[model samples]
Target chain A: XXXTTSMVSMPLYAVMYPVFNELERVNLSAAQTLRAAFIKAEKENPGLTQDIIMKILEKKSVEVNFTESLLRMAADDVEEYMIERPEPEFQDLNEKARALKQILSKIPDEINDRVRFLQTIKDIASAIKELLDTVNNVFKKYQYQNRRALEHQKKEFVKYSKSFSDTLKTYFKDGKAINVFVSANRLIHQTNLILQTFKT
Target chain B: XXXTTSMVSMPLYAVMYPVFNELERVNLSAAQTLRAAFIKAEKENPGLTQDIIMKILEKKSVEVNFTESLLRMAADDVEEYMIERPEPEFQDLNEKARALKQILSKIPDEINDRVRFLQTIKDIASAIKELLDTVNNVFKKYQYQNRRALEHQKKEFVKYSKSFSDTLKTYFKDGKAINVFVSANRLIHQTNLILQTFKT
Candidate 1:
């Protein structure tokens, strides 16, 4: 139907994956830099290293420095992600109603205040419907995108497995790798058989 | 040894324990209350009960309330535990000399800030030493009390077992609980003997 087509075609992907893939590339480089530094340090300090000295320096440099750098990177990534897509904004019309409620509580017996409070309630109800629709649209966009990504990943896995099998058949002619692959295949088959048995 | 004994006698018990005990009590009560609420909700709602509702509430409450309480507790505990010990104070003093070398990197080479810096360092070191001693004393005291409590519980368990044995002897002409207990013990021994025979 046209309604179904419209629902499927909606810009769900925009909100769901707000974080661009570029952040992961930055993290990978940062991790590589630390790994390179560690390898360099190990190479330079080779025979001169006492167990205590090696432990002290490695603990200080790798554990402390890397942890601090990673935390900073993660915080920066989150900040950058948030700036890309701001949260949905709606004018809080209920604020005036809340203030009126507070005033009514103080002047409970006043008939005029009670009548004014009833008018504010009608205004709040009207405003709330508009606000809620905006929120629901934002939520649907995110939810549909999440569902689509999950379905896409499931399909991709099947394609990936078939490609992996063809690649393995070409490369792993007759070695320990081939034996290992065959054994792994048998184990997977056994596991699936057991799962099927349990299902029945 | 005499100085160590004097240091141990410091009045840190009242200062330190109340905060830590209060935190533990709050955490235990929160856990118990939530667990009780979950069980009650489960009984009332049956299959309709939403686990995520309680999980999300508890997770948010922990982040907002419990983490702040824990951080405050840690800051107080660390200050009291580390800053008040005599041996640790001397170690801290020596460590400050190395720390000064790092701080001196920013200072200009021509200007001799060594004397003023050393004096400042000594004053800072002595103050830190005194604080660390107080903190360490609190830590030692808590550890001692905790160990004593564990020992006391073990003694109580032994007393309870003896009382139970006595009651069983009084109730049955031939203490049937003790016979049953010995039989259960023998069965365990026989099982272990069979297990040992199977071992290479």
Candidate 2:
């Protein structure tokens, strides 16, 4: 009798689990679906995010949607950004510009490095801010439109996202603010390509 | 007579010119002075943005109470972000991210190239974006403050900007989206670095 609560529907919950777990079920990242559904369910009569659609479980919300959103957004972030890390995590990747700014003075050619650093980061900063601003703006816009389908067409911006570690490490020779494993890896391939080109 | 007609105030112009150009004057990348001056200028005379500053220069008023403000803000941006590039060119760096996107589907799993490529440019793309965005945001904010002063501030952003070429080329091999010149050069440095690491 307790399972028969009118407040919730359990059968629908079962369907959403395995189905949404499948990547690209509707789109590239699970974050889109999770986040969209969370926002949609929370705002509506149904709390589809955390419950099981098994047609049995019944009670108050089980507190899964928010956690799921965070989980999915994080992984969704990694996938969207195409970050090469094997571990799924939403590590902070926004400091590239700031790192560049801090280390500009350290670049060699005292006279020109200052000017050169300034110019390069300027263009890069502008391009990147647009990426962030664009993404942020989209989030705001979609939140207003259809909360359920917010992540709809936004994964495209992940193309512009990137890590800011190597240039920082090489320039400052310091700062865990950047990455190491892949940085080293990228450096190797970078040079080989050059060698290949010259040989060709 | 042309000079005579527009010769509004010799002292103000002197203050504006050298103060502005002196940034370029000391040959210290002109970034420090220009960036500082822009923020300082806009902030003081009713915050020398663009719109108000324009009429404020002639029709209305706001004196340069804090030319000191200009100098301070100059170092403020560099101190904070640490960008290092040369020149005042607004070359297109937006293509880097887009290229990454276009090329993502083309790379092979067998080659560490995909992972290798991801690591290197991560820093490059991250650093450049802030320089441009910080400047761009500043530009938008000040666009309404003052036009005369607008040109003054805009130049400073150029100092910290850089190329979208090298990072783009190496990562997006087949694509012409990235720069070809440095791609070849950095590729060599990167290769040498990797080999050196193994040897040591």
Candidate 3:
């Protein structure tokens, strides 16, 4: 043997499988340059006798990375986890409407020029109650489980809430009450956010 | 009609509505019903002569008690709130599964008859994965939302989890692990209290 580090240049198969099966290793050595070394190793004694077959079978063993099989098998779980949890819209809609109503109740007087703001909220109060009822009707079967029963309530909230937001943007004809406008706008945004959860 | 508060002992309707509509208040009597007195005082003094009509109309007008409607609104709100949030099964399912998986991974030859425990865990890994899939299916559509999707997951978790728990209860056909059984049972029950939201 040449006395040099590079004397017995190992082949790529060793690098490839760091570990391998005996049968495949036997066949591969018969096929190529390693045949000479195989002869020496075979005649002398078993040296570092690693091969690709062992590696291949190892992949399938341990139930094949037990966790992987179990993971995918674990994925075999039968529960239907995809469905969305039902959150009833009426509660949120009613809360949003009530919040809007509270904001309007603070007005001291129905200054005729600003009477429309009062009147608008008055109508909105009636409308939302009606909305609550309509949603409740669709959701009537849900005496106990009210959330998922009425699917449209959420879509309706988005619509009604959007429509009402326009009214919330109503100018305080007094204009000096920009704070009222500002406050109303803030409520409008919050209303939309909370109700948005229903659609998802 | 009758005369005084004591003399009239004012009819229930009178006592009930207090100041009947101004017309009824007018007809009651000149003697001294709350109605008659209110009417007289109303004309002479624009003081805090609070006619309950103002009170009644106040109740009707602009819906001033918006918050009251909603405190009760918040009432029904909370019922819904509680119902929407209670899905406690699978977290315990998941956590318990992880707990078992971790315990098995460190085994130095399945101490005692724990090898059966290992095999039980293996089967559990399969079953839970199946259960996990079932739960995941229910939860799939619940992005940015929570509660309803995992109904079956909880159901399945209860099934598989209970089964697995019993297996853990099956200590190598031995009688040493009652402590393990007791600890696991508490988790199953504890899981439900905090998460009864999905089904409600």
Clashes of each: 13, 70, 38
Candidate 2 vs. true structure, TM-score: 0.15
In terms of lDDT, the poorest run of 10 residues in model 3 chain A is A47-56
**Candidate 1 lDDT, A54-120, residue by residue in tens:** 2222222232232233222221221111212333331221232223223222221221364764564
Best by TM-score: 3
Q: Candidate 2 on A52-142: residue-level lDDT in tens?
A: 1211111101211221222222212212233232222212222322232223322222213647755645654564464355435434533
Cα lDDT computed for each candidate against the true fold: 0.30, 0.31, 0.37
Error of 2 at A185 (Å): 12
Worst 10 residues of 2 chain B by lDDT: B59-68
Task: Please identify which of the two predictions, 1 or 3, would achieve the higher TM-score against the true structure.
Answer: 3
CAPRI-style quality class for the chain A–B interface of candidate 3: incorrect
By the DockQ metric, which is better: model 1 or model 3? 1
lDDT of 2 by residue, B1-200 (tens): 55421222222332334433433433333324333534443333331222211222221001111111221222222122221232232122223222322233222221246576565456445544643454454345433322344333344323322223434554455432212322322232332232222123
Query: How does chain B score by TM in each prediction?
Result: 0.21, 0.22, 0.26
Interface RMSD of 2: 30.1
Scored by DockQ, the top model is 1
Candidate 2 regions exceeding 4 Å error are A1-114, A143-162, A174-200, B1-200
For candidate 3, what is the DockQ? 0.01
How many clashes in candidate 2? 70
Ten contiguous residues with the weakest lDDT in model 3 chain B: B53-62
